[PDB]
Amino acid sequence: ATESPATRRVQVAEHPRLLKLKEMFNSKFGSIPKFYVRAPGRVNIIGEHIDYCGYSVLPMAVEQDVLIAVEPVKTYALQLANTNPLYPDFSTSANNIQIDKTKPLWHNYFLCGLKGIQEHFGLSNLTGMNCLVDGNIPPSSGLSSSSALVCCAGLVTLTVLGRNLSKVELAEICAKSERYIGTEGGGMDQSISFLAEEGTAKLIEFSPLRATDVKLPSGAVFVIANSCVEMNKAATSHFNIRVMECRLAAKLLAKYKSLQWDKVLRLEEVQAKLGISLEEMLLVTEDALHPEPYNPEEICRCLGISLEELRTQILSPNTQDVLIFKLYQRAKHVYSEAARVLQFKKICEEAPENMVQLLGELMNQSHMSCRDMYECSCPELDQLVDICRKFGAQGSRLTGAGWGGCTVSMVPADKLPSFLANVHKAYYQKQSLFATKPGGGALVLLEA
Numbered sequence: 255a256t257e258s259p260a261t262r263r264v265q266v267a268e269h270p271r272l273l274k275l276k277e278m279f280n281s282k283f284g285s286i287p288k289f290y291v292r293a294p295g296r297v298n299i300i301g302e303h304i305d306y307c308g309y310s311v312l313p314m315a316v317e318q319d320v321l322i323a324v325e326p327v328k329t330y331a332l333q334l335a336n337t338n339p340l341y342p343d344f345s346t347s348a349n350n351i352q353i354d355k356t357k358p359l360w361h362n363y364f365l366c367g368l369k370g371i372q373e374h375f376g377l378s379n380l381t382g383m384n385c386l387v388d389g390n391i392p393p394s395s396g397l398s399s400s401s402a403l404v405c406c407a408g409l410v411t412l413t414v415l416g417r418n419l420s421k422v423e424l425a426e427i428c429a430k431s432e433r434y435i436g437t438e439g440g441g442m443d444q445s446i447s448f449l450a451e452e453g454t455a456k457l458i459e460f461s462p463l464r465a466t467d468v469k470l471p472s473g474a475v476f477v478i479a480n481s482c483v484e485m486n487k488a489a490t491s492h493f494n495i496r497v498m499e500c501r502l503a504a505k506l507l508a509k510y511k512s513l514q515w516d517k518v519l520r521l522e523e524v525q526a527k528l529g530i531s532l533e534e535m536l537l538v539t540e541d542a543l544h545p546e547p548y549n550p551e552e553i554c555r556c557l558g559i560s561l562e563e564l565r566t567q568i569l570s571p572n573t574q575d576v577l578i579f580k581l582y583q584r585a586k587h588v589y590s591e592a593a594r595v596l597q598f599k600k601i602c603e604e605a606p607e608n609m610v611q612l613l614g615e616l617m618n619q620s621h622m623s624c625r626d627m628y629e630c631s632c633p634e635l636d637q638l639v640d641i642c643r644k645f646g647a648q649g650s651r652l653t654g655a656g657w658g659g660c661t662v663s664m665v666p667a668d669k670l671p672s673f674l675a676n677v678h679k680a681y682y683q684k685q686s687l688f689a690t691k692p693g694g695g696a697l698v699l700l701e702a
């Protein structure tokens with residue numbers, strides 16, 4: 255995988271979104287864009303909250319995305335604008351990139367992406383340009399609009415710079431740079447954005463970053479349903495809490511199994527080190543970790559550390575004062591979840607006479623797990639997932655981080671309309687509810 259992001263040559267006018275964008279850029283900057291860039295958002299089919307644990311996921315890119323009209327400038331001046339009034343213009347000319355985790359203002363996600371590229375190539379000077387941002391992904395809704403902006407911003411930067419990177423590399427870089435926002439997430443979102451391929455789903459693996467086509471089942475529609483509960487990951491610690499929780503769990507797991515925990519960072523590492531299977535890993539966990547919650551002193555104790563080292567050498571800023579750590583539950587979640595993913599696939603590769611039904615299950619399982627073990631669901635998500643089921647839903651589960659956001663659901667061909675209607679009907683009574691297909695990845699667009 256040395257292939258880079260593609261370059262579509264276009265006649266602007268044939269693309270309404272584009273020409274519009276072109277028109278407003280001009281209005282905003284007195285010039286026309288030199289080029290454009292898009293990076294889709296995505297739907298995680300299954301395998302939630304395990305990317306950061308080193309485990310493989312199965313998402314697919316959505317068609318919604320972030321489109322940026324770009325114009326390079328000779329100055330050290332970065333001017334960002336957004337077609338959406340909710341997103342104020344932003345400018346800077348500083349080589350020193352200042353990202354505020356205090357109020358993740360939209361523009362900061364753009365800076366993460368730009369900043370990562372600059373650093374990748376050891377650059378200090380700000381890359382001057384004018385950009386008009388245009389995203390159609392519902393914000394803070396589980397669809398990775400943050401990552402779309404991130405990746406898009408990165409691609410743009412690289413293009414302006416006129417340097418080259420593989421899609422992989424891009425994904426890898428944008429996975430790390432997004433953290434500048436304050437989130438300690440994995441790499442599923444960026445990887446799918448850069449690696450997506452139309453008409454197929456992907457099994458994204460990590461270390462090494464790899465993607466593998468996954469042919470979806472033949473008779474069901476994947477339907478995104480937005481709970482309508484907004485979750486801004488960067489605005490709230492829940493996420494990082496879970497990140498810590500697992501990290502801690504893994505360390506303790508290693509300790510127990512007598513490995514080198516000090517080096518351990520992720521849950522899968524433990525499974526790796528032991529040479530055991532997922533199922534076995536579940537038994538380990540069951541032995542190693544007590545259900546009742548762990549505490550900071552107890553933790554310290556177990557590891558032969560100091561609260562200060564905890565705090566210091568291990569904890570996160572936004573997790574320092576946590577009293578309660580649910581190591582057992584998070585691990586139970588993680589380990590099973592990886593197993594489902596590997597399963598779901600395998601199935602997909604077999605095509606059994608009861609495919610959906612099966613897969614459906616796998617999916618309900620993810621949900622409950624996330625719900626009960628990982629505790630990253632919500633009451634709203636909870637109902638939505640039922641109702642869905644209530645109408646045809648062969649598979650329903652929250653998607654993305656959770657705590658609001660969307661849900662994905664395998665509705666079989668024929669119930670769609672009802673689903674659609676009844677759901678619409680129940681929950682609701684295109685924007686919040688709609689069907690999906692495996693979209694393609696990030697691309698450069700040249701008016702040619």
Ligand SMILES: Nc1ncnc2c1ncn2[C@@H]1O[C@H](COP(=O)(O)OP(=O)(O)NP(=O)(O)O)[C@@H](O)[C@H]1O
Nearest residue numbers: 360389393394395396397398399400486487654655
């Ligand atoms: N069109 C857009 N323009 C500017 N900023 C955007 C746009 N779309 C998304 N964002 C930014 O991205 C933020 C949402 O980030 P985030 O919390 O990660 O939600 P998400 O990416 O949709 N879901 P998830 O996959 O679970 O991480 C918003 O608060 C905005 O700051």
Ligand SMILES: CC(=O)N[C@@H]1[C@@H](O)[C@@H](O)[C@@H](CO)O[C@@H]1O
Nearest residue numbers: 302303439440441442443654655
């Ligand atoms: C950008 C970011 O942190 N992405 C993460 C992704 O890595 C994954 O953990 C997901 C839950 O499965 O929640 C987030 O959106």
Ligand SMILES: [Mn+2]
Nearest residue numbers: 398400401487
């Ligand atoms: Mn996000």
